[PDB]
Design a protein around this ligand. Structure first.
Ligand SMILES: Nc1nc2c(ncn2[C@@H]2O[C@H](COP(=O)(O)OP(=O)(O)O)[C@@H](O)[C@H]2O)c(=O)[nH]1
Ligand SMILES: [Mg+2]
Length: 179
């Protein structure tokens, strides 16, 4: 099989680890979620090509901020994430994540991923955002951001319901294979 490396980045609590867990174990972690990952090589077949895709999870706060640059060498594809229930997390895409990834991973394809799509029509989420005069991120807003940052594409998923998860990783593998 062809060996490729994926790195996932984005604001704390935007659903990175749960996304990796759901693709790998086919089960949303209902109780315990480790800070990261670590060490899962996905077997993915796309367009008649068997790929081993190493999943490198990352985190924030002092220690994991310090360590995060060590994830970047020899990356073939980046999943850059925000949460659909967090306009703040989308704002950090151009402010923080894009400059960081462009510095360490020039020319590496980026898939921009909107996580927690299940929260888009969630009553509690709507109500909490409405008191801020905010609303969940719209798909067109995600797409606009992907265009702006020069991403390979924009995708949405819910780790919680599993919807769109398989497709995120299939598209990431296609990006890792090219060029
Ligand atoms: N509603 C919803 N919650 C999610 C989803 N994915 C993760 N979460 C929750 O979001 C929180 C952070 O998830 P985690 O994967 O640890 O985020 P990370 O810090 O980006 O790795 C946890 O409480 C998860 O249960 C999702 O798709 N939908
Ligand atoms: Mg995590």
């Amino acid at each position: 099989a062809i060996r490729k490396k994926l790195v996932i980045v984005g604001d704390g609590a935007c659903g990175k680890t749960c996304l990796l867990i759901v693709n790998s174990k086919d089960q949303f972690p209902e109780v315990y979620v480790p800070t990261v990952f670590e060490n899962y090589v996905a077997d993915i077949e796309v367009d008649g090509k068997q790929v081993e895709l190493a999943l490198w999870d990352t985190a924030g706060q002092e220690d994991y901020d310090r360590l995060r640059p060590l994830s970047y060498p020899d990356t073939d594809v980046i999943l850059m994430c925000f949460s659909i229930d967090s306009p703040d997390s989308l704002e950090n895409i151009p402010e923080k994540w894009t400059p960081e990834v462009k510095h360490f991973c020039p020319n590496v394809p980026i898939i921009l991923v909107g996580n927690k799509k299940d929260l888009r029509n969630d009553e509690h989420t709507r109500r909490e955002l409405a008191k801020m005069k905010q609303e969940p991120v719209k798909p067109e807003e995600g797409r606009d951001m992907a265009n702006r940052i020069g991403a390979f594409g924009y995708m949405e998923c819910s780790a919680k319901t599993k919807d769109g998860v398989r497709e995120v990783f299939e598209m990431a593998t296609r990006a890792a294979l090219q060029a």
